[PDB]
Design a binder for this molecule. Structure first.
Ligand SMILES: C=C(Oc1cccc(C(=O)O)c1)C(=O)O
Ligand SMILES: C=C(Oc1cccc(C(=O)O)c1)C(=O)O
Lengths: 282, 283
Protein backbone atom coordinates (compact mmCIF):
# COMPACT_ATOMS: atom_id res chain seq x y z
CA UNK A 1 0.00 0.00 0.00
CA UNK A 2 3.05 2.24 -0.37
CA UNK A 3 2.90 5.50 -2.29
CA UNK A 4 2.92 5.01 -6.06
CA UNK A 5 4.37 7.36 -8.65
CA UNK A 6 1.93 9.59 -10.54
CA UNK A 7 0.96 8.33 -13.99
CA UNK A 8 2.05 11.17 -16.27
CA UNK A 9 1.40 11.57 -19.99
CA UNK A 10 3.78 13.15 -22.48
CA UNK A 11 3.21 14.21 -26.09
CA UNK A 12 5.52 12.14 -28.30
CA UNK A 13 5.86 14.85 -30.97
CA UNK A 14 8.90 17.09 -31.38
CA UNK A 15 7.04 19.98 -29.70
CA UNK A 16 7.61 18.35 -26.29
CA UNK A 17 10.99 16.74 -26.97
CA UNK A 18 12.90 19.56 -25.20
CA UNK A 19 10.59 19.10 -22.21
CA UNK A 20 11.42 15.38 -22.22
CA UNK A 21 15.12 16.32 -22.22
CA UNK A 22 14.51 18.51 -19.18
CA UNK A 23 12.55 15.80 -17.36
CA UNK A 24 15.41 13.37 -17.95
CA UNK A 25 18.30 15.71 -17.07
CA UNK A 26 16.63 16.91 -13.87
CA UNK A 27 15.88 13.32 -12.83
CA UNK A 28 12.15 14.16 -12.75
CA UNK A 29 11.38 11.12 -14.93
CA UNK A 30 12.24 8.83 -12.01
CA UNK A 31 9.36 10.38 -10.02
CA UNK A 32 6.90 9.63 -12.86
CA UNK A 33 5.31 6.59 -14.43
CA UNK A 34 5.46 8.07 -17.92
CA UNK A 35 3.22 7.30 -20.89
CA UNK A 36 4.13 8.65 -24.34
CA UNK A 37 1.46 8.88 -27.05
CA UNK A 38 -0.31 11.27 -29.40
CA UNK A 39 -2.37 14.17 -27.97
CA UNK A 40 -5.84 12.71 -28.54
CA UNK A 41 -4.93 9.41 -26.85
CA UNK A 42 -3.29 11.14 -23.89
CA UNK A 43 -6.40 13.29 -23.42
CA UNK A 44 -8.63 10.20 -23.60
CA UNK A 45 -6.46 8.42 -21.03
CA UNK A 46 -6.46 11.32 -18.55
CA UNK A 47 -10.22 11.85 -18.87
CA UNK A 48 -10.87 8.11 -18.52
CA UNK A 49 -8.61 7.78 -15.47
CA UNK A 50 -5.70 5.82 -16.98
CA UNK A 51 -3.43 8.79 -16.20
CA UNK A 52 -3.28 11.10 -13.19
CA UNK A 53 -1.57 14.12 -14.79
CA UNK A 54 -0.80 14.99 -18.39
CA UNK A 55 -1.07 17.26 -21.42
CA UNK A 56 -4.61 17.84 -22.66
CA UNK A 57 -5.48 19.31 -26.04
CA UNK A 58 -7.41 22.48 -25.24
CA UNK A 59 -10.81 21.57 -26.71
CA UNK A 60 -10.87 18.30 -24.75
CA UNK A 61 -9.89 20.13 -21.56
CA UNK A 62 -12.79 22.56 -22.03
CA UNK A 63 -15.25 19.71 -22.61
CA UNK A 64 -14.05 18.27 -19.27
CA UNK A 65 -13.19 21.46 -17.35
CA UNK A 66 -15.27 20.48 -14.30
CA UNK A 67 -13.10 17.36 -13.85
CA UNK A 68 -9.63 18.79 -14.57
CA UNK A 69 -7.27 21.24 -12.87
CA UNK A 70 -4.92 23.05 -15.25
CA UNK A 71 -1.30 23.75 -14.36
CA UNK A 72 -0.36 27.45 -14.38
CA UNK A 73 2.62 28.76 -16.36
CA UNK A 74 3.12 25.84 -18.76
CA UNK A 75 1.26 25.01 -21.98
CA UNK A 76 1.88 24.28 -25.65
CA UNK A 77 1.24 27.48 -27.56
CA UNK A 78 2.36 30.27 -29.87
CA UNK A 79 2.23 34.02 -30.42
CA UNK A 80 2.00 34.13 -34.18
CA UNK A 81 3.21 31.07 -36.08
CA UNK A 82 3.17 27.69 -34.37
CA UNK A 83 4.82 25.91 -37.37
CA UNK A 84 3.38 22.48 -36.50
CA UNK A 85 -0.36 23.19 -36.89
CA UNK A 86 -1.21 23.89 -40.52
CA UNK A 87 -3.75 23.84 -43.31
CA UNK A 88 -2.13 22.34 -46.42
CA UNK A 89 -4.17 23.24 -49.49
CA UNK A 90 -3.94 22.85 -53.26
CA UNK A 91 -6.19 25.91 -53.74
CA UNK A 92 -6.67 29.30 -52.09
CA UNK A 93 -8.63 28.96 -48.86
CA UNK A 94 -11.57 30.95 -50.24
CA UNK A 95 -12.13 28.25 -52.91
CA UNK A 96 -12.81 25.48 -50.36
CA UNK A 97 -16.59 25.95 -50.15
CA UNK A 98 -18.10 22.51 -50.65
CA UNK A 99 -14.63 21.04 -51.20
CA UNK A 100 -13.31 18.01 -49.35
CA UNK A 101 -10.99 18.76 -46.43
CA UNK A 102 -9.27 15.97 -44.48
CA UNK A 103 -8.90 16.43 -40.71
CA UNK A 104 -5.99 14.54 -39.17
CA UNK A 105 -7.45 12.28 -36.50
CA UNK A 106 -4.75 13.04 -33.91
CA UNK A 107 -6.05 16.61 -33.53
CA UNK A 108 -8.99 18.00 -31.59
CA UNK A 109 -8.09 21.68 -31.13
CA UNK A 110 -6.30 22.62 -34.37
CA UNK A 111 -9.06 21.03 -36.46
CA UNK A 112 -11.65 23.12 -34.60
CA UNK A 113 -9.53 26.26 -34.98
CA UNK A 114 -9.24 25.55 -38.72
CA UNK A 115 -13.01 25.07 -39.00
CA UNK A 116 -13.57 28.34 -37.11
CA UNK A 117 -11.18 30.26 -39.38
CA UNK A 118 -12.55 28.85 -42.64
CA UNK A 119 -16.18 29.55 -41.74
CA UNK A 120 -16.03 32.78 -39.73
CA UNK A 121 -13.01 34.45 -41.35
CA UNK A 122 -12.91 33.08 -44.92
CA UNK A 123 -16.59 32.11 -45.25
CA UNK A 124 -16.29 28.65 -46.76
CA UNK A 125 -18.13 25.48 -45.73
CA UNK A 126 -16.02 22.46 -46.74
CA UNK A 127 -17.08 18.82 -46.60
CA UNK A 128 -15.01 17.65 -43.64
CA UNK A 129 -13.95 14.11 -42.83
CA UNK A 130 -11.49 12.63 -40.35
CA UNK A 131 -8.70 10.28 -41.40
CA UNK A 132 -5.23 9.20 -40.26
CA UNK A 133 -2.60 11.92 -40.76
CA UNK A 134 -0.96 11.19 -44.13
CA UNK A 135 -0.24 14.17 -46.38
CA UNK A 136 0.36 12.13 -49.54
CA UNK A 137 -2.91 10.21 -49.21
CA UNK A 138 -4.87 13.25 -48.01
CA UNK A 139 -3.82 15.26 -51.07
CA UNK A 140 -4.93 12.46 -53.42
CA UNK A 141 -8.51 12.48 -52.12
CA UNK A 142 -9.01 15.91 -50.50
CA UNK A 143 -8.33 19.45 -51.69
CA UNK A 144 -6.90 20.47 -48.30
CA UNK A 145 -5.83 18.86 -45.05
CA UNK A 146 -5.34 19.88 -41.41
CA UNK A 147 -2.23 18.43 -39.77
CA UNK A 148 -0.49 18.76 -36.41
CA UNK A 149 2.71 17.47 -34.83
CA UNK A 150 5.73 16.17 -36.72
CA UNK A 151 3.64 15.60 -39.85
CA UNK A 152 2.61 19.26 -39.89
CA UNK A 153 6.18 20.46 -39.31
CA UNK A 154 7.22 18.18 -42.17
CA UNK A 155 4.53 19.54 -44.50
CA UNK A 156 5.50 23.10 -43.51
CA UNK A 157 9.28 22.86 -43.91
CA UNK A 158 9.78 20.07 -46.46
CA UNK A 159 6.79 18.61 -48.33
CA UNK A 160 5.02 21.91 -48.99
CA UNK A 161 7.95 23.75 -50.58
CA UNK A 162 8.95 20.71 -52.65
CA UNK A 163 5.51 20.18 -54.20
CA UNK A 164 4.37 23.81 -54.37
CA UNK A 165 1.55 23.33 -51.86
CA UNK A 166 0.20 26.21 -49.80
CA UNK A 167 0.83 25.68 -46.08
CA UNK A 168 -1.11 28.06 -43.81
CA UNK A 169 0.10 28.34 -40.22
CA UNK A 170 -2.97 28.10 -37.96
CA UNK A 171 -1.27 30.18 -35.27
CA UNK A 172 -0.53 32.92 -37.81
CA UNK A 173 -4.07 32.83 -39.21
CA UNK A 174 -5.41 33.26 -35.67
CA UNK A 175 -2.93 36.06 -34.91
CA UNK A 176 -3.94 37.84 -38.12
CA UNK A 177 -7.62 37.44 -37.26
CA UNK A 178 -7.50 38.37 -33.56
CA UNK A 179 -4.06 39.76 -32.73
CA UNK A 180 -3.94 37.14 -29.98
CA UNK A 181 -1.56 34.30 -29.15
CA UNK A 182 -2.93 30.76 -29.03
CA UNK A 183 -2.80 27.78 -26.67
CA UNK A 184 -3.21 24.33 -28.23
CA UNK A 185 -2.73 22.17 -25.12
CA UNK A 186 -2.44 22.57 -21.36
CA UNK A 187 -1.18 20.36 -18.55
CA UNK A 188 -3.82 19.18 -16.11
CA UNK A 189 -4.37 16.89 -13.16
CA UNK A 190 -7.56 14.90 -12.74
CA UNK A 191 -9.59 16.71 -10.10
CA UNK A 192 -9.96 13.56 -8.00
CA UNK A 193 -6.20 12.97 -8.06
CA UNK A 194 -5.37 16.59 -7.25
CA UNK A 195 -7.69 16.47 -4.24
CA UNK A 196 -6.43 13.08 -3.03
CA UNK A 197 -2.72 13.93 -3.47
CA UNK A 198 -2.33 17.73 -3.34
CA UNK A 199 1.39 17.49 -2.53
CA UNK A 200 2.31 15.03 -5.28
CA UNK A 201 0.32 17.14 -7.74
CA UNK A 202 2.19 20.27 -6.63
CA UNK A 203 5.61 18.60 -6.92
CA UNK A 204 4.77 17.30 -10.40
CA UNK A 205 3.71 20.81 -11.44
CA UNK A 206 6.90 22.38 -10.06
CA UNK A 207 9.04 19.66 -11.66
CA UNK A 208 7.45 20.38 -15.05
CA UNK A 209 8.23 24.09 -14.70
CA UNK A 210 11.84 23.38 -13.75
CA UNK A 211 12.25 20.89 -16.61
CA UNK A 212 10.66 23.33 -19.06
CA UNK A 213 12.95 26.13 -17.87
CA UNK A 214 16.00 23.89 -18.27
CA UNK A 215 14.94 22.99 -21.82
CA UNK A 216 14.69 26.69 -22.68
CA UNK A 217 18.31 27.17 -21.58
CA UNK A 218 19.62 24.10 -23.44
CA UNK A 219 17.53 24.41 -26.61
CA UNK A 220 20.59 24.29 -28.88
CA UNK A 221 21.92 21.13 -27.24
CA UNK A 222 18.50 19.50 -27.67
CA UNK A 223 18.25 20.58 -31.32
CA UNK A 224 21.73 19.28 -32.16
CA UNK A 225 21.00 15.85 -30.67
CA UNK A 226 17.50 15.52 -32.14
CA UNK A 227 18.68 16.59 -35.61
CA UNK A 228 20.58 13.29 -35.87
CA UNK A 229 17.25 11.41 -35.86
CA UNK A 230 15.05 13.68 -38.00
CA UNK A 231 14.80 14.95 -41.56
CA UNK A 232 15.00 18.43 -39.99
CA UNK A 233 18.41 19.95 -39.38
CA UNK A 234 19.68 21.59 -36.19
CA UNK A 235 18.86 25.16 -37.23
CA UNK A 236 15.30 24.22 -38.19
CA UNK A 237 14.66 22.38 -34.92
CA UNK A 238 16.15 25.23 -32.87
CA UNK A 239 13.95 27.70 -34.77
CA UNK A 240 10.92 25.49 -34.10
CA UNK A 241 11.66 25.08 -30.38
CA UNK A 242 12.23 28.82 -29.91
CA UNK A 243 9.14 29.73 -31.94
CA UNK A 244 6.86 27.61 -29.75
CA UNK A 245 5.57 29.44 -26.67
CA UNK A 246 5.29 27.38 -23.48
CA UNK A 247 4.01 30.16 -21.22
CA UNK A 248 0.57 30.01 -19.63
CA UNK A 249 -0.22 33.23 -17.78
CA UNK A 250 -2.75 36.04 -18.11
CA UNK A 251 -2.18 36.81 -21.84
CA UNK A 252 -2.44 33.12 -22.75
CA UNK A 253 -5.58 32.64 -20.65
CA UNK A 254 -7.13 35.63 -22.43
CA UNK A 255 -6.55 33.78 -25.70
CA UNK A 256 -8.10 30.58 -24.31
CA UNK A 257 -11.08 32.60 -23.05
CA UNK A 258 -11.75 34.15 -26.46
CA UNK A 259 -11.25 30.91 -28.41
CA UNK A 260 -13.58 29.02 -26.06
CA UNK A 261 -16.26 31.68 -26.50
CA UNK A 262 -16.12 31.51 -30.30
CA UNK A 263 -16.22 27.70 -30.61
CA UNK A 264 -18.18 26.51 -27.54
CA UNK A 265 -21.65 26.58 -29.11
CA UNK A 266 -20.28 24.63 -32.12
CA UNK A 267 -18.05 22.24 -30.12
CA UNK A 268 -20.06 20.93 -27.17
CA UNK A 269 -19.27 23.04 -24.10
CA UNK A 270 -20.49 26.38 -22.70
CA UNK A 271 -19.05 29.52 -24.27
CA UNK A 272 -18.14 30.77 -20.76
CA UNK A 273 -16.64 27.52 -19.42
CA UNK A 274 -14.55 27.97 -16.27
CA UNK A 275 -10.85 27.02 -16.32
CA UNK A 276 -9.69 26.00 -12.83
CA UNK A 277 -5.98 26.53 -12.13
CA UNK A 278 -3.88 24.66 -9.59
CA UNK A 279 -3.45 27.01 -6.67
CA UNK A 280 -0.05 27.31 -4.94
CA UNK A 281 0.37 27.03 -1.20
CA UNK A 282 0.06 30.19 0.88
CA UNK B 1 10.56 10.18 -44.29
CA UNK B 2 13.61 7.98 -44.88
CA UNK B 3 15.69 9.64 -42.16
CA UNK B 4 17.52 7.51 -39.62
CA UNK B 5 15.34 6.30 -36.75
CA UNK B 6 16.30 5.89 -33.11
CA UNK B 7 17.06 2.33 -31.97
CA UNK B 8 14.19 0.60 -30.18
CA UNK B 9 15.68 -0.19 -26.77
CA UNK B 10 14.17 -2.27 -23.98
CA UNK B 11 14.61 -1.63 -20.28
CA UNK B 12 13.76 -3.79 -17.27
CA UNK B 13 11.17 -1.99 -15.14
CA UNK B 14 12.34 -3.64 -11.89
CA UNK B 15 14.37 -1.86 -9.23
CA UNK B 16 17.50 -3.72 -10.38
CA UNK B 17 17.78 -1.41 -13.41
CA UNK B 18 16.38 1.77 -11.85
CA UNK B 19 19.86 3.27 -11.26
CA UNK B 20 20.71 2.56 -14.91
CA UNK B 21 17.51 4.36 -15.93
CA UNK B 22 18.69 7.31 -13.83
CA UNK B 23 21.99 7.21 -15.73
CA UNK B 24 20.30 7.00 -19.13
CA UNK B 25 18.16 10.01 -18.21
CA UNK B 26 20.90 12.12 -16.62
CA UNK B 27 23.32 11.59 -19.52
CA UNK B 28 20.60 12.44 -22.05
CA UNK B 29 21.03 8.99 -23.61
CA UNK B 30 17.26 8.39 -23.38
CA UNK B 31 16.73 10.97 -26.13
CA UNK B 32 18.76 8.76 -28.48
CA UNK B 33 16.51 5.78 -27.66
CA UNK B 34 12.94 4.82 -28.39
CA UNK B 35 12.51 3.19 -25.00
CA UNK B 36 10.24 0.30 -24.00
CA UNK B 37 9.91 -0.58 -20.31
CA UNK B 38 8.55 -4.01 -19.38
CA UNK B 39 9.34 -7.19 -17.46
CA UNK B 40 12.36 -9.33 -18.39
CA UNK B 41 10.40 -12.12 -20.08
CA UNK B 42 8.38 -9.71 -22.23
CA UNK B 43 11.46 -7.70 -23.22
CA UNK B 44 13.19 -10.95 -24.21
CA UNK B 45 10.23 -12.03 -26.35
CA UNK B 46 10.05 -8.61 -28.02
CA UNK B 47 13.76 -8.57 -28.90
CA UNK B 48 13.74 -12.16 -30.19
CA UNK B 49 10.67 -11.55 -32.37
CA UNK B 50 11.94 -8.21 -33.68
CA UNK B 51 9.81 -5.65 -31.84
CA UNK B 52 13.03 -4.25 -30.31
CA UNK B 53 16.50 -3.73 -31.78
CA UNK B 54 18.56 -3.75 -28.56
CA UNK B 55 17.68 -4.72 -25.01
CA UNK B 56 18.18 -6.79 -21.87
CA UNK B 57 17.71 -10.54 -22.29
CA UNK B 58 17.36 -13.03 -19.45
CA UNK B 59 20.33 -15.36 -19.82
CA UNK B 60 18.48 -18.59 -20.64
CA UNK B 61 16.52 -16.89 -23.43
CA UNK B 62 19.71 -15.32 -24.79
CA UNK B 63 21.43 -18.71 -24.93
CA UNK B 64 18.45 -20.33 -26.67
CA UNK B 65 18.84 -17.60 -29.34
CA UNK B 66 22.61 -17.10 -29.22
CA UNK B 67 23.00 -17.50 -32.99
CA UNK B 68 20.74 -14.47 -33.54
CA UNK B 69 21.94 -12.11 -30.79
CA UNK B 70 25.14 -10.18 -30.06
CA UNK B 71 25.83 -9.59 -26.37
CA UNK B 72 27.24 -6.31 -25.05
CA UNK B 73 30.56 -6.65 -23.18
CA UNK B 74 31.10 -5.17 -19.72
CA UNK B 75 27.46 -4.71 -18.69
CA UNK B 76 25.01 -7.29 -17.34
CA UNK B 77 22.68 -7.93 -14.40
CA UNK B 78 24.52 -10.20 -12.00
CA UNK B 79 26.02 -10.94 -8.61
CA UNK B 80 29.08 -12.35 -6.86
CA UNK B 81 27.43 -14.03 -3.92
CA UNK B 82 23.97 -12.79 -2.97
CA UNK B 83 21.79 -11.17 -5.62
CA UNK B 84 18.96 -10.36 -3.12
CA UNK B 85 16.23 -10.28 -5.80
CA UNK B 86 16.30 -13.94 -6.94
CA UNK B 87 15.21 -16.24 -4.12
CA UNK B 88 13.67 -19.51 -3.03
CA UNK B 89 11.11 -18.85 -0.28
CA UNK B 90 10.40 -22.06 1.60
CA UNK B 91 8.37 -23.19 4.61
CA UNK B 92 10.67 -26.21 5.06
CA UNK B 93 14.39 -26.95 4.72
CA UNK B 94 15.39 -27.37 1.09
CA UNK B 95 16.28 -31.03 1.69
CA UNK B 96 12.62 -31.72 2.60
CA UNK B 97 11.33 -30.69 -0.84
CA UNK B 98 11.56 -34.12 -2.50
CA UNK B 99 8.08 -34.74 -3.88
CA UNK B 100 6.92 -31.41 -2.43
CA UNK B 101 5.21 -28.63 -4.37
CA UNK B 102 7.39 -25.74 -5.56
CA UNK B 103 5.86 -22.74 -7.31
CA UNK B 104 7.88 -21.15 -10.12
CA UNK B 105 7.11 -17.50 -10.80
CA UNK B 106 6.02 -17.19 -14.42
CA UNK B 107 8.03 -14.02 -15.13
CA UNK B 108 11.36 -15.84 -14.73
CA UNK B 109 13.31 -17.95 -17.20
CA UNK B 110 16.83 -18.00 -15.74
CA UNK B 111 16.34 -17.99 -11.95
CA UNK B 112 13.73 -20.75 -12.16
CA UNK B 113 16.17 -22.90 -14.14
CA UNK B 114 18.97 -22.13 -11.66
CA UNK B 115 16.69 -23.10 -8.77
CA UNK B 116 15.82 -26.41 -10.44
CA UNK B 117 19.51 -27.07 -11.10
CA UNK B 118 20.44 -26.37 -7.47
CA UNK B 119 17.59 -28.40 -5.97
CA UNK B 120 18.19 -31.43 -8.19
CA UNK B 121 21.96 -31.45 -8.72
CA UNK B 122 23.18 -29.92 -5.44
CA UNK B 123 20.57 -30.88 -2.84
CA UNK B 124 19.23 -33.96 -4.62
CA UNK B 125 15.51 -33.24 -4.23
CA UNK B 126 12.89 -33.71 -6.95
CA UNK B 127 9.91 -31.41 -6.32
CA UNK B 128 6.62 -31.30 -8.18
CA UNK B 129 7.19 -28.02 -9.98
CA UNK B 130 4.43 -25.83 -11.37
CA UNK B 131 4.34 -22.36 -12.91
CA UNK B 132 2.04 -19.57 -11.71
CA UNK B 133 1.94 -15.77 -11.59
CA UNK B 134 4.34 -14.32 -9.00
CA UNK B 135 2.32 -13.84 -5.80
CA UNK B 136 3.93 -15.00 -2.56
CA UNK B 137 0.65 -15.11 -0.63
CA UNK B 138 -1.03 -17.44 -3.13
CA UNK B 139 2.16 -19.47 -3.64
CA UNK B 140 2.59 -20.06 0.10
CA UNK B 141 -1.06 -21.10 0.51
CA UNK B 142 -0.61 -23.92 -2.03
CA UNK B 143 3.11 -24.77 -2.20
CA UNK B 144 5.92 -25.58 0.21
CA UNK B 145 8.33 -23.26 -1.63
CA UNK B 146 8.35 -20.60 -4.33
CA UNK B 147 10.90 -19.07 -6.71
CA UNK B 148 10.65 -15.29 -7.17
CA UNK B 149 12.61 -12.60 -9.02
CA UNK B 150 12.51 -8.83 -9.27
CA UNK B 151 10.76 -6.52 -6.82
CA UNK B 152 8.58 -9.37 -5.54
CA UNK B 153 11.69 -11.37 -4.63
CA UNK B 154 13.32 -8.40 -2.92
CA UNK B 155 10.07 -7.85 -1.03
CA UNK B 156 9.98 -11.47 0.14
CA UNK B 157 13.66 -11.23 1.10
CA UNK B 158 13.57 -7.99 3.10
CA UNK B 159 9.95 -7.80 4.31
CA UNK B 160 7.56 -10.73 3.83
CA UNK B 161 9.97 -13.51 4.79
CA UNK B 162 11.08 -12.02 8.11
CA UNK B 163 7.52 -11.01 9.00
CA UNK B 164 6.09 -14.52 8.50
CA UNK B 165 9.15 -16.53 9.59
CA UNK B 166 9.79 -17.92 6.10
CA UNK B 167 13.20 -19.09 4.94
CA UNK B 168 14.47 -17.03 2.00
CA UNK B 169 17.41 -18.58 0.15
CA UNK B 170 19.41 -16.28 -2.13
CA UNK B 171 19.95 -18.04 -5.47
CA UNK B 172 23.19 -16.14 -6.09
CA UNK B 173 24.52 -17.25 -2.71
CA UNK B 174 23.43 -20.86 -3.29
CA UNK B 175 25.27 -20.90 -6.63
CA UNK B 176 28.33 -19.24 -5.07
CA UNK B 177 28.39 -21.89 -2.33
CA UNK B 178 28.08 -24.66 -4.92
CA UNK B 179 30.58 -23.34 -7.49
CA UNK B 180 32.54 -20.44 -6.01
CA UNK B 181 31.44 -18.49 -9.09
CA UNK B 182 29.52 -15.27 -9.65
CA UNK B 183 26.30 -15.40 -11.67
CA UNK B 184 24.77 -13.49 -14.57
CA UNK B 185 20.98 -13.40 -14.77
CA UNK B 186 20.56 -11.11 -17.79
CA UNK B 187 22.73 -9.60 -20.53
CA UNK B 188 22.26 -6.76 -22.99
CA UNK B 189 22.14 -7.76 -26.64
CA UNK B 190 21.49 -6.38 -30.09
CA UNK B 191 19.66 -8.41 -32.69
CA UNK B 192 22.27 -9.74 -35.08
CA UNK B 193 20.43 -8.32 -38.10
CA UNK B 194 20.30 -4.87 -36.49
CA UNK B 195 23.95 -5.00 -35.40
CA UNK B 196 25.01 -5.87 -38.95
CA UNK B 197 22.76 -3.25 -40.55
CA UNK B 198 23.67 -0.46 -38.09
CA UNK B 199 27.10 -1.23 -36.58
CA UNK B 200 27.83 2.34 -35.45
CA UNK B 201 24.42 2.96 -33.85
CA UNK B 202 24.81 -0.37 -32.05
CA UNK B 203 28.29 0.64 -30.84
CA UNK B 204 27.12 4.06 -29.66
CA UNK B 205 24.19 2.46 -27.80
CA UNK B 206 26.63 0.05 -26.15
CA UNK B 207 28.98 2.89 -25.18
CA UNK B 208 26.06 4.97 -23.91
CA UNK B 209 24.92 2.10 -21.67
CA UNK B 210 28.42 1.76 -20.20
CA UNK B 211 28.62 5.51 -19.52
CA UNK B 212 25.15 5.57 -17.96
CA UNK B 213 25.97 2.51 -15.85
CA UNK B 214 29.21 4.10 -14.64
CA UNK B 215 27.37 7.28 -13.65
CA UNK B 216 24.74 5.27 -11.77
CA UNK B 217 27.51 3.59 -9.75
CA UNK B 218 28.73 7.03 -8.68
CA UNK B 219 25.28 8.34 -7.69
CA UNK B 220 23.80 5.22 -6.08
CA UNK B 221 22.90 7.01 -2.85
CA UNK B 222 21.08 9.82 -4.67
CA UNK B 223 19.09 7.23 -6.65
CA UNK B 224 18.20 5.27 -3.51
CA UNK B 225 17.08 8.41 -1.68
CA UNK B 226 14.74 9.37 -4.53
CA UNK B 227 13.38 5.86 -5.11
CA UNK B 228 12.76 5.21 -1.41
CA UNK B 229 9.93 7.77 -1.52
CA UNK B 230 7.99 5.47 -3.88
CA UNK B 231 8.78 2.02 -2.41
CA UNK B 232 8.17 0.02 0.74
CA UNK B 233 11.97 -0.26 0.96
CA UNK B 234 13.90 2.51 2.67
CA UNK B 235 17.01 4.29 1.38
CA UNK B 236 19.48 2.06 3.26
CA UNK B 237 17.85 -1.09 1.87
CA UNK B 238 17.78 0.19 -1.71
CA UNK B 239 21.38 1.41 -1.50
CA UNK B 240 22.53 -1.96 -0.16
CA UNK B 241 20.59 -3.68 -2.96
CA UNK B 242 22.03 -1.46 -5.71
CA UNK B 243 25.59 -1.93 -4.42
CA UNK B 244 25.19 -5.69 -3.92
CA UNK B 245 24.17 -6.16 -7.56
CA UNK B 246 27.10 -6.69 -9.93
CA UNK B 247 26.79 -5.13 -13.39
CA UNK B 248 30.17 -6.26 -14.71
CA UNK B 249 30.43 -8.58 -17.70
CA UNK B 250 34.05 -9.50 -18.33
CA UNK B 251 36.10 -12.69 -18.22
CA UNK B 252 35.09 -13.87 -14.70
CA UNK B 253 31.41 -13.29 -15.47
CA UNK B 254 31.63 -15.07 -18.83
CA UNK B 255 33.28 -18.01 -17.05
CA UNK B 256 30.16 -18.27 -14.88
CA UNK B 257 27.85 -18.06 -17.91
CA UNK B 258 29.86 -20.77 -19.67
CA UNK B 259 29.56 -23.24 -16.79
CA UNK B 260 25.88 -22.51 -16.11
CA UNK B 261 25.12 -23.00 -19.81
CA UNK B 262 27.01 -26.30 -19.82
CA UNK B 263 25.06 -27.70 -16.86
CA UNK B 264 21.57 -26.77 -18.09
CA UNK B 265 21.88 -26.44 -21.89
CA UNK B 266 20.86 -29.92 -23.09
CA UNK B 267 17.76 -29.83 -20.84
CA UNK B 268 16.85 -26.18 -21.53
CA UNK B 269 17.10 -25.87 -25.33
CA UNK B 270 20.63 -24.92 -26.35
CA UNK B 271 23.99 -26.72 -26.68
CA UNK B 272 26.04 -27.16 -23.52
CA UNK B 273 28.89 -25.45 -25.42
CA UNK B 274 26.74 -22.71 -26.98
CA UNK B 275 28.80 -19.87 -28.43
CA UNK B 276 28.29 -16.40 -26.95
CA UNK B 277 29.12 -13.75 -29.54
CA UNK B 278 30.20 -10.42 -28.04
CA UNK B 279 30.01 -7.03 -29.72
CA UNK B 280 33.50 -6.41 -31.00
CA UNK B 281 35.18 -3.02 -30.44
CA UNK B 282 36.80 -1.00 -33.20
CA UNK B 283 40.50 -1.26 -34.04
C1 LIG C 1 2.03 22.40 -31.00
C2 LIG C 1 1.06 21.64 -31.47
O1 LIG C 1 -0.27 21.95 -31.16
C3 LIG C 1 -1.07 20.92 -30.67
C4 LIG C 1 -0.65 20.14 -29.60
C5 LIG C 1 -1.47 19.13 -29.12
C6 LIG C 1 -2.71 18.90 -29.70
C7 LIG C 1 -3.13 19.69 -30.76
C8 LIG C 1 -4.49 19.46 -31.42
O2 LIG C 1 -4.74 19.98 -32.53
O3 LIG C 1 -5.36 18.75 -30.85
C9 LIG C 1 -2.31 20.69 -31.24
C10 LIG C 1 1.42 20.44 -32.35
O4 LIG C 1 0.55 19.57 -32.62
O5 LIG C 1 2.58 20.35 -32.82
C1 LIG D 1 18.73 -9.69 -10.70
C2 LIG D 1 17.64 -10.28 -11.13
O1 LIG D 1 17.78 -11.44 -11.91
C3 LIG D 1 17.00 -11.57 -13.07
C4 LIG D 1 16.83 -10.52 -13.95
C5 LIG D 1 16.07 -10.70 -15.09
C6 LIG D 1 15.48 -11.93 -15.35
C7 LIG D 1 15.66 -12.98 -14.47
C8 LIG D 1 15.04 -14.35 -14.71
O2 LIG D 1 15.00 -15.19 -13.78
O3 LIG D 1 14.56 -14.64 -15.84
C9 LIG D 1 16.42 -12.80 -13.33
C10 LIG D 1 16.27 -9.72 -10.76
O4 LIG D 1 15.22 -10.31 -11.10
O5 LIG D 1 16.21 -8.66 -10.09
Amino acid sequence: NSRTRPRVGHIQFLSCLPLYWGLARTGTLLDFELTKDTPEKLSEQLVRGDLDIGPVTLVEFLKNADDLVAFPDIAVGCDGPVMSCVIVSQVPLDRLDGARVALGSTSRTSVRLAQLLLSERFGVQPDYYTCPPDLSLMMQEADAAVLIGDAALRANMIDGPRYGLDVHDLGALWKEWTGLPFVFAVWAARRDYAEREPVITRKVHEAFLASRNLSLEEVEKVAEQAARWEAFDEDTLAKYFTTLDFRFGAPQLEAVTEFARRVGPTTGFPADVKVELLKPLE
